């Protein structure tokens, strides 16, 4: 009948912020959790490309229990550390804090903290 | 080029009849029609004296349609000097009748009866009128 | 009992009567808002507290404090005054409370017909109303202001209206 415009979710959770835009794009940290696992990514800027991308499953390859729980907070810090380290070896710590939907202590509280264990400090 | 309106906060500037650009309608309602050649300030006492005359020679027949409407007010100075702007309702109100636009429309009748009907209606109009048909 | 009956008789018939498919996607209540408006116009805080401490018994949940929406009406009502409450239960607290009105409370009410008119909203939702003469195991006609009724709007996950009464009828709701 009549076309209606509705601002999408990722357009009201206060995703994009000002200041950080001092650079064409701020080094955000994709710390989103699915409905079973959690995926982390240190997406770069400018146009695209990233430094290092890790997941809950990928960790299982290095050294982790097979049928081990993932949603557990214990895995959070594990997913935040696996993505780290190598990310720094790629050049230099270029990750910031970006997350809209997790009430501070969200399943990302350990993801951001894990970065403070490899070198990233703010 | 006027028709019964309704009360409102009507009271603005005069305006200015521009090029034929705007006006340029055609023949939609009614068989034949009638257009103008040069813009002007048509008052209400002209359209009414022309509409009734359009059916004055008919009486109980077809239907009359008006594809026009006045807007541009008309302020006139009483007799004194010029201290401010006019009222806007001393005499009446008008609009702009640029050429190319259609005015009166007649249908549901013969060609002759619909021909003489526009004749008298054209006499009531201060500006020259052009008679057309269709196509 | 009310929740259990759902997946052992309610859903089953909802699978044969309607289109045959999976198990879910069947009419299921999501919440029950038994709002109990208060006599507007009269500016009294007593009626407000007499309401919040009224439904907080039958539902065992602290009511709400709705505010008069900003608008220009005929009366001399202003914006910012509370004049109603609407509590909604979910999960076990929902099925349990819903089972009450079905089993108890009714036909406890003297002279209870049961014949309901058209109703329906137009999207798998149903609502009812109780006169100023109801009865609930929680309500106490010993220490209360005046006999007052309340509204009960029960919304489900039904897509159409024909899938609304089919969920409450086989459930136990008076029809």
């Amino acid at each position: 009948k009549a076309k209606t415009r509705r601002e999408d979710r990722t357009a009201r959770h206060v995703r994009i912020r000002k200041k950080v835009e001092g650079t064409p794009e701020r080094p955000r940290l994709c710390v989103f959790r699915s409905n079973k696992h959690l995926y982390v990514q240190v997406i770069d800027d400018s146009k695209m490309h990233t430094l290092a991308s890790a997941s809950t499953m990928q960790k299982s390859i290095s050294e982790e229990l097979d049928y081990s729980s993932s949603p557990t907070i214990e895995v959070a810090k594990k997913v935040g550390e696996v993505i780290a380290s190598a990310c720094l070896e790629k050049g230099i710590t270029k990750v910031a804090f970006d997350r809209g939907g997790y009430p501070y202590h969200g399943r990302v509280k350990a993801l951001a903290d894990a970065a403070r264990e490899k070198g990233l400090q703010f | 080029m006027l028709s019964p309106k309704r009360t409102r906060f009507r009271k603005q500037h005069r305006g200015r009849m521009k090029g034929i650009s705007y006006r340029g309608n055609r023949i939609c309602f009614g068989r034949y029609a009638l257009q103008a050649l040069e813009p002007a300030w048509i008052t209400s006492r002209q359209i009414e004296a022309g509409r009734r005359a359009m059916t004055r020679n008919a009486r109980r027949g077809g239907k009359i349609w008006v594809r026009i409407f006045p807007d541009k007010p008309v302020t006139v100075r009483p007799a004194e000097t010029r201290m401010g702007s006019g009222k806007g309702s001393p005499e009446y109100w008008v609009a702009v009748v640029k050429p190319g636009r259609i005015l009166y429309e007649i249908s549901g009748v013969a060609e002759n009866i619909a021909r003489r009907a526009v004749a008298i209606a054209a006499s009531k109009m201060p500006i020259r009128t052009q008679f057309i048909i269709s196509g | 009992r009310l929740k259990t009956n759902y997946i052992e008789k309610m859903v089953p018939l909802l699978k044969e009567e309607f289109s045959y498919s999976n198990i879910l996607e069947v009419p299921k209540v999501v919440k029950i808002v038994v709002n109990c408006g208060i006599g507007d116009a009269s500016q009294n805080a007593k009626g407000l507290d007499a309401a919040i401490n009224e439904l907080a018994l039958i539902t065992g949940q602290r009511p709400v404090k709705t505010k008069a929406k900003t608008s220009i009406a005929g009366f001399k009502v202003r914006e910012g005054m509370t004049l109603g409450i609407a509590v909604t239960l979910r999960g076990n607290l929902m099925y349990s409370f819903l089972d009450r009105l079905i089993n108890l409370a009714l036909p406890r009410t003297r002279d209870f017909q049961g014949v309901n008119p058209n109703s329906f909203d137009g999207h798998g939702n149903y609502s009812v109303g109780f006169r100023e003469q109801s009865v609930f195991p929680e309500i106490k006609p010993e220490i209360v202001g005046k006999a007052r009724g309340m509204d009960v709007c029960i919304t489900t996950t039904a897509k159409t209206d024909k899938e609304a009464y089919k969920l409450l009828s086989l459930m136990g709701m008076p029809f």
Binding site: - | - | A56, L93, S96, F97, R100, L104, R108, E138
Partner: protein, 72 residues
């Protein structure tokens, strides 16, 4: 403190039936003829208007039909 215990009343929640001995929970006439029942409102009788349309069907028999006086 009345605001202390919000009163869950879980007992009445899960156990809605409880004991019908205390209060009648649908033991009376939920929807059935009470006693004698002598109510004749406008919705009864007047509603279901018993249609009464009788006519004369053609039969096979020799009988003279027609009144003494003829009239349209």
């Amino acid at each position: 403190k009345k605001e202390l215990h919000p009163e869950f009343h879980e007992d009445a929640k899960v156990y809605c039936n409880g004991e019908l001995v205390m209060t009648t929970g649908g033991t009376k006439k939920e929807y059935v003829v009470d006693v004698w029942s002598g109510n004749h409102p406008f919705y009864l009788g007047n509603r279901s208007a018993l249609m009464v349309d009788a006519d004369q069907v053609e039969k096979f028999r020799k009988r003279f039909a027609g009144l003494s006086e003829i009239m349209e």
